[PDB]
Amino acid sequence: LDRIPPIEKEIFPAMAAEGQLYAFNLEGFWMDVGQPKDYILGMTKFIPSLVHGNRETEAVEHQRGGRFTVIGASLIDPSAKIGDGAVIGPYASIGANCVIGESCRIDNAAILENSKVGKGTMVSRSIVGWNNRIGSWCHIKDISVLGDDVEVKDGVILIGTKVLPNKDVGEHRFEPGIIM
Amino acid sequence: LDRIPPIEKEIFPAMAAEGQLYAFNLEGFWMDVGQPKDYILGMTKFIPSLVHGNRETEAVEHQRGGRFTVIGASLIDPSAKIGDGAVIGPYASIGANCVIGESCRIDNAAILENSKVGKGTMVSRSIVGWNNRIGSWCHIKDISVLGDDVEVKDGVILIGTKVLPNKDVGEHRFEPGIIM
């Protein structure tokens, strides 16, 4: 600690000038989670590193509310209900009290907090809001982030579109964009 | 029968000229099934007229292979297997030996002869081939006709595209067109 009014970061050039700066090589993964794409990539790199950390034949989480199959490792919150014939894809996370329909596909996607999901939808490489209420037969794929308390009708196809909070969606979007 | 070498609509002007032509007014439906769109419209007008004709609380066909729900009247071939949680939409037809997945949406669509359908797909206002083999989580909607012995991979979205026989589809199509 030295009083340096505005500042070469932490005075690193001088730190090397007196030659007391050391480096520690890391064998593990490293990436900056600053974007939704980087968010998904960090999740898919970080999930396998938690095998010895937390509680969760692929037995990361297999029988919660019914006989469903998980292709790869995933984080299933114990209070959640998965359904009867869902297929939780590789490297997926699900929050507390989340409800997943009778048959679903959660592929490399994150479901946060209290969310309801219908029957037959596919959530691929995407994120959903906190109190999100998702339709039954929709199709959400690519890097699309859904804000808080959004709702989508049945049979909508959001492909890489970010929606703002409290909005409502009822129409297809086949191109990247933003919904206000 | 009179020998008229070539043509005037079987000589209807003269037929009326001798004044021996009668007409019968029809109270029922009538339309020319010459296009897939007209095919779908004729099906949706003709299905309700068969309530007293053939064998098939909405009890047109309710329990075949599992406890599934039918929203409206539909024609389910007895040899078919519907699944466990399918939702056969209004005015749909299914051919013999057809297999429908655990949860499906057959909405105003026709399935012809031996076809297999995965889990969670949606077939809306469309037709499928004879020996068609449909993927699991696909999404086929709008007026799209699939030829004979076509196959679609998982998670494809065909929106109003007509595919030729024996072809294979593995990529999305968000616009009307033809696949060779």
Author numbering:
A (entry chain B), B (entry chain D): 191 to 196, 201 to 250, 256 to 379
From the paper:
A prominent therapeutic target for antileishmanial drug development is leishmanial GDP-mannose pyrophosphorylase (GDP-MP or GMPP, EC 2.7.7.13), an enzyme catalyzing the formation of GDP-mannose by condensation of mannose-1-phosphate (Man-1-P) and GTP. As GDP-mannose serves as a central precursor for biosynthesis of diverse glycoconjugates necessary for host–parasite recognition and is essential for parasite survival, disruption of Leishmania GDP-MP activity leads to complete loss of virulence, suggesting this enzyme as an attractive target for development of new drugs against leishmaniasis. LdGDP-MP exhibits a hexameric structure with a molecular weight of ~245.3 kDa, consistent with previous observations. Each subunit is made of two separate domains, a N-terminal Rossmann-like fold commonly observed in nucleotidyltransferases and many other nucleotide-binding proteins, and a C-terminal left-handed β-helix domain containing tandem repeats of a [I/L/V]-G-X(4) hexapeptide motif, a characteristic structure found in the transferase hexapeptide repeat family.
We next solved the structure of LdGDP-MP in the absence of any cofactor or substrate at the resolution of 3.4 Å using single-particle cryo-EM imaging technique, which comprises of six subunits and exhibits a D3 symmetry with a dimension of ~104 Å × ~104 Å × ~108 Å. The homoheximeric LdGDP-MP complex is organized as a dimer of trimers, with each subunit pinched by two neighboring subunits via two interacting regions, namely, interface-1 and interface-2. In interface-1, the two subunits are attached in a shape-complementary manner between the region around the canonical signature motif GGXGXR(L)XPLX5PK of pyrophosphorylases (PPases)8 in one protomer and the C-terminus of another protomer; whereas interface-2 formation is mediated exclusively by the two C-terminal domains crossed at ~70 degrees. The contact surfaces for interface-1 and interface-2 amount to ~590 Å2 and ~750 Å2, respectively; and the interactions are established predominantly by hydrophobic interactions together with a few hydrogen bonds. Strikingly, replacement of R23 with alanine (R23A) caused loss of ~77% activity, whereas the mutations of P364N365 to arginines (PN), deletion of the last three residues on the C-terminus (ΔIIM), their combination (PN&ΔIIM), or deletion of the entire C-terminal domain (C-del) rendered the enzyme completely inactive, indicating the essential role of interprotomer communication in attaining leishmanial GDP-MP activity. On the other hand, disruption of the interface-1 contacts led to instability of the quaternary organization, as evidenced by drastic changes in the oligomerization status.
